Ligand binder design. Structure first.
Ligand code: HEM
Ligand code: HEM
Ligand SMILES: Cc1cc(N)nc(COc2cc(CCN3CCC3)cc(F)c2F)c1
Ligand SMILES: Cc1cc(N)nc(COc2cc(CCN3CCC3)cc(F)c2F)c1
Ligand SMILES: C[C@H](O)[C@H](O)[C@H]1CNc2nc(N)[nH]c(=O)c2N1
Ligand SMILES: C[C@H](O)[C@H](O)[C@H]1CNc2nc(N)[nH]c(=O)c2N1
Ligand SMILES: [Zn+2]
Lengths: 418, 414
């Protein structure tokens, strides 16, 4: 048993679910790595083609978990499924997931995402099976439908599209973009940077691949899609499918003159979904923004848009010294604007108050119906107004459950070109 | 073996070798992280205390480039003599200053450690009575306050012997405000201290029952019953809170004390336990303006400030809470700065901690840090420590938590 306490309410939860974790956190009883971005490399199999005594134990575990999930442990379906996975592994060195299994696993990878504040919705995910895909064109078709379905004219809906799992390791399916919709980043001759500095490298690869950049500040980047190991290919997302929100302020009417807008759909496309030892290297998933993600990190990180400068200038704030708190004051107004713009354009968005409050309820639900809920306090607490949100005062146990979403190398570091 | 932390804003990479020198547990396991548990994981026998003393003396004589020296070996032999004869030992005045400064340096949760080497150590191990402690603590306060030009200081009382003669400051801080619950359920003063306020009142304290009553010192010497003493009001430096733009802010009637002085911790050096060691420095703005005034369990003046700010308080997404919080923290910094009372804003504080950290990696081989505590409780990502990876491990000497004395003390009078 392991108890967590909330210090605003004295609610104590008891955690047993953590007993079912397998992967090292990176911590030891002598050092805590809770603030390391990538604390561990304990993966469940060797990098590529696994042997039978390697793959099957994980497969047996997942199927066991899935059938245990639906009250059918040891049933005919369960015991045949096992024999079915054995022969597949024997005869193909891999195995294929049933549709139900794939959906269970996608959902429980989100459910186990200890960094995600949005998980109260984990059961409501739409899974798009794209395992039949064979080309970057087909990849591009699956993604456009994902984008269109998920955007739903602003009434955003969470979805994941799952492309063929990794086989030998070279025949990887990869979305080279980090998100499906990101703005481009242009290294300027005068040292500075136009657009999104996070994407300078990726923007240059696109240019290097033949992308003709319109060299603005909010240039939607092409899709760079790689299928069964081949060279990636540029596809331009139909603009009518990329919903965008112009940022304006409900009070400062000069705020719209800053010319800012952000895209409506956050869709993480460079991560790896892992289920029963299988590895889906292309699984773009999407939901809706927490407003701080755009207004705190995307606009106000130093290595990002860094618009605190401008916003505070137009607000007439003493930017001489830090003690005036001019960054804080502009930061709030930016995030107020971002929220008011998305809500005015009927585009789904949630503020950090609602979301954190939502996540407290999710934890409660999880400790009652599951015996625990893995949460990463460093990532749940929003990057502004930490202590006025309920999660700041909530103790959290962090631990690694499978299925999960894993990081993976940026493909251009590892891809032998053709 | 080495370990690397990265700053994701600057891409600076530091190599922690110091984490090897730790041997106290964090509470994390290999398969579970407890990094956000507030408190994770009678006294030392002879055999327990020998190596702890040995490790500390060894580390002391290393620090001063005297390891293996004649004085190093004689000191070791001297410490063993005492632990045999008396089942404990006594630190030298150098050792006490060195251990107290290093327990601060080793405090992973403190963002203010760039100052650790300028700690003023007051040795109070001759104290025998609560009156003696009042005297010592008053002198601490007068020295640390320095007419608003604050100075860092710890006052260290006799260590623990058998656990039945502990010195303890029952106050959590040396200056705090009282909290009184009302019949109607509301709270006058500081709701954090309601319990300790009741303990005082019960002990005979005649309370003013105002919003900012400085609490009495509840002092325990040699395991006797604690005793009440009123800090002389002229040694309590206070700052009336006003706002540089909102003339109406002074009408909130708010004030805070200028001297942060934590008194309920235990100082541990070489296996010795100093159960009473109040220490003080100066405030970071957010500790008063974010947590003291705006936690729902505390003064909860977001409510009022937003109202007078004419904010839309219906929907959260108006961020009225965020917007008012910023203004309360502007008011706090401007008030202190105006009254020339020392205060550091959270940007300057986090900046200095990154500098400190990198310096500690250069010369010491690492610097344990509790990201969950280092990040200020507001505007997290726009400070450099948010993007700073940090390794957390437990070095000794350290400051440690201990039970509240009214949970464990057994009484004497009547
Ligand atoms: C529906 C609304 C959602 C919201 C508001 C939300 C919010 C967040 C936030 C704020 C983070 C912190 C990362 C950052 O700040 O950049 C995060 C992380 C994450 N989210 Fe969610 N999320 C949502 C949906 C989803 C969905 C649909 C999935 C997958 C199916 C998902 C998977 C993840 C993962 C895997 C991580 C972090 C993984 C890691 O870094 O180890 N989220 N989320
Ligand atoms: C000189 C200026 C100082 C500043 C600005 C400062 C600031 C802080 C802050 C903001 C915290 C976080 C705690 C909270 O917010 O509740 C903290 C924790 C702490 N500080 Fe410092 N501090 C200072 C001096 C000192 C001194 C002089 C000592 C001891 C001699 C010390 C030891 C500690 C300890 C032990 C903790 C908490 C560790 C724990 O609770 O486990 N600090 N400090
Ligand atoms: C689906 C979804 C909805 C939503 N609203 N937000 C998110 C955030 O997704 C993620 C963001 C990051 C960024 C990490 N930072 C950049 C360098 C550090 C990493 C991940 F692994 C994520 F999964 C996802
Ligand atoms: C000397 C000094 C200067 C300064 N500016 N701030 C501090 C705050 O340090 C501390 C803060 C807390 C908060 C604990 N809360 C009760 C549950 C959470 C506990 C401690 F033990 C500290 F030491 C100390
Ligand atoms: C639950 C969580 O561990 C707790 O609220 C912590 C978080 N970080 C903190 N950080 C500081 N500086 N002070 C605190 O009291 C806390 N409390
Ligand atoms: C060093 C630190 O772990 C790193 O910057 C983390 C901190 N917390 C975060 N929290 C969220 N939500 N997103 C992030 O990218 C990060 N970055
Ligand atoms: Zn840990």
């Amino acid at each position: 048993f392991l108890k967590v306490k909330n210090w605003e309410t004295e609610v104590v939860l008891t955690d047993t679910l953590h007993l079912k974790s397998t992967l090292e956190t990176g911590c030891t009883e002598y050092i805590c790595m809770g603030s390391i971005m990538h604390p561990s490399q304990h993966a469940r199999r060797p990098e590529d083609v696994a042997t039978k005594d390697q793959l099957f134990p994980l497969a047996k575990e997942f199927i066991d978990q899935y059938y245990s999930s639906i009250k059918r442990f040891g049933s005919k379906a369960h015991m045949e499924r096992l024999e079915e996975v054995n022969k597949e592994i024997d005869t193909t060195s891999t195995y294929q997931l049933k549709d139900t299994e794939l959906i269970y696993g996608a959902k429980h990878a989100w459910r186990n995402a200890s960094r995600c504040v949005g998980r109260i919705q984990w059961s409501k995910l739409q899974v798009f099976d794209a395992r039949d895909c064979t080309t970057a064109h087909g990849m591009f078709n699956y993604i456009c439908n994902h984008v269109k379905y998920a955007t739903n004219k602003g009434n955003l809906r969470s979805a994941i599209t799952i492309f063929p799992q990794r086989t030998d390791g070279k025949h990887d399916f990869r979305v080279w973009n980090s998100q499906l919709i990101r703005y481009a980043g242009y290294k300027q001759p005068d040292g500075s940077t136009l657009g999104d500095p996070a994407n300078v490298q990726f923007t240059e690869i696109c240019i290097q691949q033949g992308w003709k950049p319109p060299r603005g500040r909010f240039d939607v980047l092409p899709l760079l899609l790689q299928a069964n190991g081949n060279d990636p290919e540029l596809f331009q997302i139909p603009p009518e499918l990329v919903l965008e929100v112009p940022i304006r302020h409900p009070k400062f009417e000069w705020f719209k003159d800053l010319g800012l807008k952000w895209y409506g759909l956050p869709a993480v496309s460079n991560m790896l979904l892992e289920i029963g030892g299988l590895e889906f290297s292309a699984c773009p998933f999407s939901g809706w923004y927490m407003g701080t993600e755009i207004g705190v990190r995307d606009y106000c990180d130093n290595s990002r848009y860094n618009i605190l400068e401008e916003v505070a200038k137009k607000m007439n704030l003493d930017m001489r010294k830090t003690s005036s708190l001019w960054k804080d004051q502009a930061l709030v107004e930016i995030n107020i604007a971002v929220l008011y713009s998305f809500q005015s354009d009927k585009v789904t968005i949630v503020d950090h108050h609602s979301a954190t409050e939502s996540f407290i309820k999710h934890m409660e639900n999880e400790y009652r119906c599951r015996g625990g809920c893995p949460a990463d306090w460093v990532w749940i607490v929003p990057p502004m107004s930490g202590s006025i949100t309920p999660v700041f005062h909530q103790e959290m146990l962090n631990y690694r459950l499978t299925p999960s979403f894993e990081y993976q190398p940026d493909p251009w570091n590892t891809h032998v070109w053709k």
